Amino acid sequence: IFTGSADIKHLLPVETQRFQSISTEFLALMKKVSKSPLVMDVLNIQGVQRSLERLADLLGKIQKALGEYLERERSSFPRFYFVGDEDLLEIIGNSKNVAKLQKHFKKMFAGVSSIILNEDNSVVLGISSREGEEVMFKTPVSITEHPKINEWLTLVEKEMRVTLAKLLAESVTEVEIFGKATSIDPNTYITWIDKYQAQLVVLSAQIAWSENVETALSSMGGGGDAAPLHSVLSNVEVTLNVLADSVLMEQPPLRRRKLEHLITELVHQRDVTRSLIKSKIDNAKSFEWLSQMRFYFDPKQTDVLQQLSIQMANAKFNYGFEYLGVQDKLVQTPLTDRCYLTMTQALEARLGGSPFGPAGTGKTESVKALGHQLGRFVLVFNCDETFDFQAMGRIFVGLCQVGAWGCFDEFNRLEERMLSAVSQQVQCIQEALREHSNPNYDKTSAPITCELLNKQVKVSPDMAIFITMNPGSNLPDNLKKLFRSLAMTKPDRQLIAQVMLYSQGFRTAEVLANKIVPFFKLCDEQLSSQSHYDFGLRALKSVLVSAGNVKRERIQKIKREKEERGEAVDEGEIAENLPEQEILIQSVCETMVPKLVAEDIPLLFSLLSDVFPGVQYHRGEMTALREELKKVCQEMYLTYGDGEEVGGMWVEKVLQLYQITQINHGLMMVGPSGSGKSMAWRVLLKALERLEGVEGVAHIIDPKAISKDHLYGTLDPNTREWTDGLFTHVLRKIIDSVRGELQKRQWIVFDGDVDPEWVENLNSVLDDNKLLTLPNGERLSLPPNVRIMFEVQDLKYATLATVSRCGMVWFSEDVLSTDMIFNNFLARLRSIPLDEGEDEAQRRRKGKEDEGEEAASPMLQIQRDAATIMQPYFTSNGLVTKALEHAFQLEHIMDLTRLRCLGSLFSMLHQACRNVAQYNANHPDFPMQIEQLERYIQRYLVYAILWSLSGDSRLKMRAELGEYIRRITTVPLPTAPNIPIIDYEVSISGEWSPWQAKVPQIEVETHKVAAPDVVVPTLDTVRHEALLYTWLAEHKPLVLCGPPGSGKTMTLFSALRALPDMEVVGLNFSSATTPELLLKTFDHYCEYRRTPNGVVLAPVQLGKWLVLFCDEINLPDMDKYGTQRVISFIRQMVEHGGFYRTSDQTWVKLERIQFVGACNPPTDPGRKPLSHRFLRHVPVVYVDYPGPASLTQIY
Amino acid sequence: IAKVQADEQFGIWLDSSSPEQTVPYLWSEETPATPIGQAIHRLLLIQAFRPDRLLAMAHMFVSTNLGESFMSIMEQPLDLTHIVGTEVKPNTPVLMCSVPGYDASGHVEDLAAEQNTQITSIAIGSAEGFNQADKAINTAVKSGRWVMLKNVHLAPGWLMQLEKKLHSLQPHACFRLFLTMEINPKVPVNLLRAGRIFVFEPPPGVKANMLRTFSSIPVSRICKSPNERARLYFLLAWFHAIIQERLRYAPLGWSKKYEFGESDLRSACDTVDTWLDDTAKGRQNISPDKIPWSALKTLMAQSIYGGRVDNEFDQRLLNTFLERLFTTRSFDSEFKLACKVDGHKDIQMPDGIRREEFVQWVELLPDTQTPSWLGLPNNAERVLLTTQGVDMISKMLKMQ
Amino acid sequence: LKRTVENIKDPLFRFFEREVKMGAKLLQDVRQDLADVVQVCEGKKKQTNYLRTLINELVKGILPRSWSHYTVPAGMTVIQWVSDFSERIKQLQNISLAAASGGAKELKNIHVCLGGLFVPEAYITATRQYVAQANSWSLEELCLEVNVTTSQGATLDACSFGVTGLKLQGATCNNNKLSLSNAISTALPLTQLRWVKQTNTEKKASVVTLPVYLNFTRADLIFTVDFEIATKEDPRSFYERGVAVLCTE
């Protein structure tokens, strides 16, 4: 407290002097203790007990004196009860730096997000909203003349209320002219709307309508002619026509929101006037008029809080004149009318309100809207797990003292202890409120108080408590008799949609509403149960707003086209000759299709056609980006297609991802593994780079390979030393823009599982705030170019908050076709030479078409011939595809994925062409002829198909796949009567040769007879060793799985040690294994070198590849969200080829480092199934028991 | 089957009002059955033919086995005098559980009044209430005094602590602790197990409900000017009864069991007071046309009673009841509170204009209430009965 | 049900597929639990905690909570539940045979017992969309007209669908007109749900809107039916007496 702000010492000089004296004594004592830290030595210090008791007494006195000072400051300015002790100390302590107070005005006030200061921060000229709307004080508050924070802040609040009252008086005086008129000039009306604040505009229009209707009814009481009400309705309709004409035009966002609020108001006013005319009310005291919320403005009243009266039925409140900023007005449906009536009746009866119903029915929104209609400050307390229990008493005292409203989002979500305590507090406050209703009470002196925070807190009559509940349950037994319940169970979505569509300029608002509400019901009940699906009222409102935006952009496009031509321009004419249904369907599709799984798109379009018959959705044409995408896909060997062509779904997915990047700043790709997410966003980044000319940089940050502290940074509590985490370091580097980071498109991709632990700090970044709050206290603003991107497999352990804050693009596995992967493999084989490493790798980028480099190497020619021969088998219905479907039919030791098998097959084919190369090198005189090379490659393709699709399968299923291949192929398979095809090797020549021929007959010495390093070569041993050599030539994370005792560990170790340039490191994994084990292994066996490209982690021994034999891949335990952190680390290091140092926050690229794993079947106890994003890269082989012949040979 | 077809009076029996008292002979046996055998055979026959009468037949079975006066004590009013004096030990709390909305503290208040034993009544729920409770418990245990602890269902953990305190405590011979509750699952099992339990339920019926309503509302409140005020309360009282009794016949009466209770009645009385005071403005008499019928109907249909109602058909039923009762026609001499009652003769609203006249009319109501009073069909009772009958059998399965 | 290219476009097929998918899983669960109970009662299986509590509930008649994955009447015993389950699964087998051998269009001509279905409101939604798709009508311009036909095998129009098992509580439907009845409940022989184009004709004073509740507990509302009042009967009498329609009794 006394070393955080210098002004705290000035506020409390006696206490500062006292603490300085104590601190001196305490530091001397602690030095004495540090000299002799033994507990017996400390206990033997002379008079230590008495000194510590005296220090405890004095320190308690200062802490109390400080608490009393804080309580006095809170009592002087009751709104300070809404900020904590640290925030309050910051507010009063930072008196000179007024600009530090602007971050707390949102907690204290309703719509006041900041205050506008003078040149020298000595005069408060007014207040400002979060949107930007400003209120200029009539008489500015001078801080210099009132230096105390409480004094000038109270003057700011009082001048807020006075200025709002005076501006409302002026606005009402102006709008009475429009009310008493038959033709409102659009320009004058728009000028009036621009002049006054949104809440004052809506309130003035409400006041004018109420006065006009009351005068009309008073006249008809004697006259008996319905002419005055007809005039009122005609005026409302004329003003509504003017508002519609204005809202079709192009308006500033603030004026647009004001127009929408005014339209929502006037629709309700026209409805009420029509009801009054239809029911033939002639008296102003009839309940058909009394039940409507009426506004009686009395400008002559000296007290601003008693100038405007809002009366509904019996109840009669006063406008609190609280600046609400630009709030979201609600469509005044009959359900909301009933809510207003019930809550006002409860408030007049001094009872609280309890709207109950299913979530999303507008309960807390209706409570907040009623509070804002009365000019009150409503605080909504979310009763989820993130509930401030310790602050509840302070906030309750604040509500009682300032006369603010308090709404609980879902009071039944609280746990039993919090529920009971908050119920007791609500009960005492509501009993205090009931004590205001006794007529015998003396109103001259009314100090009604309640027992809050163990003190008598005065309760203002204007405050109220609302308890929104969700049945399935009921109010606590103590609050049942103090609260009036209301069933808000079915919002009138049709009228909400109709009024919002009318406010967006749609002429056929009613038809479109009656179409779009049942359609959203259909989608919510006919689309696959998905967590990211949201067809509620909020989503419907967002869709309607987007449809209005689409309508206005079409209008602007037509207007610009006509301006370019010689044709005249008329906004209303353009709006009339314009399809509203097509715009609504376009908005619905553009909002929902990216989130849809492959099965739900046909369903969505079927339900759509059912509701909108004959209306077709045509996707926007994007020829420039399409051609850039095609060029990038050609460059990256990817497959491109338009519409129904191969790659069409992938291209439409990348276009959807682009539109989501345009709309949102945070977004997710939640397709399954191997569905084209990474290629989609990389190709989009490169296409945008080539199209817009803005450089694109991506920061793939696996959030689970590192801890939360290593991701967001941490500060030492002992020394207050701050460390930047990986994400914070990246964001800070972008913000600083030392090398023009703001001039480059920065995408922060995460590429890891999403859980409600590492995204909590990201919630404010993904929200509209676009701000990262650090435990240090820094507030890092998200730059406009930065795009936070999540590439995930699923959303099983993701919060609805994170899903809602982010755009959604679902990459169903149908997006990526097997033909697309086959084409990619063939193009890469025909283009990229296998033998060439660093050379001819950058030459691919340096050459746009690589003219004159067709014969780059003999390797390239050999693999081009191989691709030519393998082309027939990699067709749409070729051998590989049918074999893959059959393998999908079979059962495997691991969860089968298409890309695991396909990658294993491609690596085996690469090894086949490498074998052709080594044969050519060993026989310069006789190059391997075309016929022999065709035979060998066909046979090796069959071999690779069997060993890649049935590698996980048992011997029976390997035989089944071999028989299926034999049935469905024409290549010459071995003619063995009773020997499996997988028992044969393809030699260099096209002929097969049994594996048993390659098995030698070794002899073991007398000792070491059963040594743990002797491996007797058998058919399985040599076969698996060949597979290891194949898949380790390409440095894949080969995994052998099988029952215990089969020989996985010994075969792996023997084969790895057989390789000369190979350092084998055994890393036994267990449930306690974490990535720090791999980091320790890298520290022990490797070194980091700062190459010009970047940090490279390479083995200390040059010219040798380090293999990390991880003996039990399955064992590492999953989190409570089902994720093995070390497995994710290995996946990152094998996919992205590197990781991130937790000390430097820099990318470290691996060099000459491999991974090999062994497992027991995942069905065994203690073994967890590996993630599909990890299994995609690993080739898994089922090492079954050797069998009678192999056992016979070995033993 | 053969005996059913051959019997001629089977049709008149199956349609009889009380078939259990005249069950005919439809079982074949080698030797004549004992009275309990005939009772069980008639119980089976009633269950097969007229399940609604099963409960009544069940009673007869008990009457044939445990005597005709086995249950006869229960219909008699509870006599707490002897039970508290002898049966209940000083360290055994008397738990007095009422249905939600009902009160049972008045019983022991009158018990202590007639016993001339000092009793201290304490309302539980607040910390000051807890301190008053435990200090009064200590004073009474050391002085042989009676303690009332009202609405102790509000503090379950404090109830557990009280049970633990009573277990070790050794009271005086005249100490008596009464704890009143509204039957909640929150009540500790150990407290219920270690205390005498008394369950209180209100006497069902429109007459009893209206008598309770008139007792709860003060006479002076109903007596305030204008003189029409009393009549309004009568209608309101009637309305309250008509809905609460209808709650017994759910789901046919109300689609679900709403918590229409004292809170709604107080809110409706307050609404009537406010609106009638606004309309009358001090006049001693106002015309029946001047009463804000629309205001009362709307506030009771959407705010007072309609707040709990979430079904649209239940809201429609509530609106129909309110539009039928609260009109100017209710101030006529021939207004019919309930039509087609029992299929013949209909309830007429009392002609009087004073509170005592309305209470007298309530007290002279015939003790022959049928669901036709509530607007329900007269067979609704039968449905209720058969449900209860099935329910009994289900409970009898759970005791197996 | 065997999902094909043409069958997936049928809303009725999709509904029936979801229904049978739920029913088969519930069938397997209940049958396995009963087999375990039989094994324990035969003496060859040890009473585990789940087995012990299941046996206790079956002996006491309490409906197991692991069972009843669909909407069921509250407080209902195990015997009623297994009887209703047998009837529902028999209906599901009939609809499965109709879908496999009778063709997709037969699903339009088959009479469906709303009580047997787990989600009959989804069936009513499907029927509406079917009519809309066949007649190229927009979905929201369709309103439901109910025609009670006492004739056996009454002809079904293109937009008229047959529904059986409907019970009328406290009323009798003669010539598609309701009369107040002192009977406990009457059974509607065959209800033709006909999805007609909505018309702005004012609803008559002799027309009553009756809720079609899922079961006798009146806890789930499926839809509403507009019926015609017969003779001089006030609709307020229908409202007060609690007249309604039940999918199952």
Ligand SMILES: Nc1ncnc2c1ncn2[C@@H]1O[C@H](COP(=O)(O)OP(=O)(O)NP(=O)(O)O)[C@@H](O)[C@H]1O
């Ligand atoms: N080809 C072989 N030559 C020699 N011994 C073999 C051979 N195959 C299996 N064995 C024996 O079988 C056992 C295999 O041990 P090991 O290689 O540790 O099995 P594993 O597959 O790693 N089983 P686990 O780690 O328990 O899941 C040893 O006792 C070996 O001696």
Ligand SMILES: Nc1ncnc2c1ncn2[C@@H]1O[C@H](COP(=O)(O)OP(=O)(O)OP(=O)(O)O)[C@@H](O)[C@H]1O
């Ligand atoms: N447009 C394309 N044309 C051809 N092949 C493609 C295309 N997109 C992707 N592929 C192939 O499919 C593979 C998987 O694609 P990608 O790496 O984008 O998957 P992902 O969705 O990010 O999966 P994971 O969850 O494993 O990270 C690529 O490595 C490539 O071989």
Ligand SMILES: Nc1ncnc2c1ncn2[C@@H]1O[C@H](COP(=O)(O)OP(=O)(O)O)[C@@H](O)[C@H]1O
């Ligand atoms: N009368 C209305 N006009 C406009 N929108 C409404 C109306 N009623 C409800 N909504 C919308 O319905 C959603 C319900 O959200 P909210 O009320 O916060 O949750 P709950 O309904 O569970 O309390 C809100 O997003 C709100 O925009």
Ligand SMILES: [Mg+2]
């Ligand atoms: Mg909500």
Ligand SMILES: [Mg+2]
């Ligand atoms: Mg990826």
Ligand SMILES: [Mg+2]
């Ligand atoms: Mg091993």
